[PDB]
Write a protein that binds this ligand. Structure first.
Ligand SMILES: N=C(N)NCc1ccccc1CCCCCCCCCC(=O)N[C@H](CCCCN)C(=O)NO
Ligand SMILES: [Ca+2]
Ligand SMILES: [Ca+2]
Ligand SMILES: [Ca+2]
Ligand SMILES: [Zn+2]
Ligand SMILES: [Zn+2]
Ligand SMILES: [Zn+2]
Ligand SMILES: [Zn+2]
Length: 166
């Protein structure tokens, strides 16, 4: 596993998040459910707790966009970049952005929101890319219809080395 320079991390176990907008590719419940599961794979092996906010500024603001969406990291249409998140910190820290130019789904079609978001939140939590082809933090996409997706060994060690067990 790999940590960001200066070992960026949150200084609190209770984080909040908010879904700013949704993709038309799937139902709103699906989207909501995908993100909830994405966070759980991380909170399941650490003391980290996540709670969704209906309004206001949360630690982790989630959103979909195309091309230029407001930051200095614009998307590139279909394929290529799928999403990008900011490491822990104030403002953009922890924020996760999804390319709505891709087709998001909750199945083996297009790009699985749940899997990609689980990877993204790993960045929002303080994990950089892993060089282990068997880790969730590996920089290449792959689908998994596996029931009850568990966090790979490498990712577990990397997240616990930051917030301890849980
Ligand atoms: N062996 C495998 N496939 N394990 C993973 C893995 C294991 C188990 C289940 C799913 C996956 C796939 C998770 C998503 C993989 C994301 C791959 C990157 C796609 C391109 C992209 O969006 N890159 C930006 C780069 C920009 C960073 C600069 N600020 C990125 O960093 N996204 O996160
Ligand atoms: Ca793209
Ligand atoms: Ca933030
Ligand atoms: Ca889309
Ligand atoms: Zn709703
Ligand atoms: Zn509402
Ligand atoms: Zn962005
Ligand atoms: Zn990544």
């Amino acid at each position: 596993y790999n940590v960001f320079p200066r070992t960026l991390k949150w200084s609190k176990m209770n984080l909040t998040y908010r879904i700013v907008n949704y993709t038309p590719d799937m139902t709103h419940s699906e989207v909501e459910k995908a993100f909830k599961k994405a966070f759980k794979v991380w909170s399941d092996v650490t003391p980290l707790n996540f709670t969704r906010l209906h309004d206001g500024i949360a630690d982790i603001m989630i959103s979909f966009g195309i091309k230029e969406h407001g930051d200095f990291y614009p998307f590139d249409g279909p394929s290529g970049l799928l999403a990008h998140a900011f490491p822990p910190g104030p403002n953009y820290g922890g924020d996760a952005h999804f390319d709505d130019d891709e087709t998001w789904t909750s199945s083996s079609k297009g790009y699985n929101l749940f899997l990609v978001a689980a990877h993204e939140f790993g960045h929002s939590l303080g994990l950089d890319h892993s060089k282990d082809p068997g880790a969730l933090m590996f920089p290449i996409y792959t689908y998994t219809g596996k029931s009850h997706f568990m966090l790979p060994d490498d990712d577990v060690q990397g997240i616990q080395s930051l917030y301890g067990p849980g």
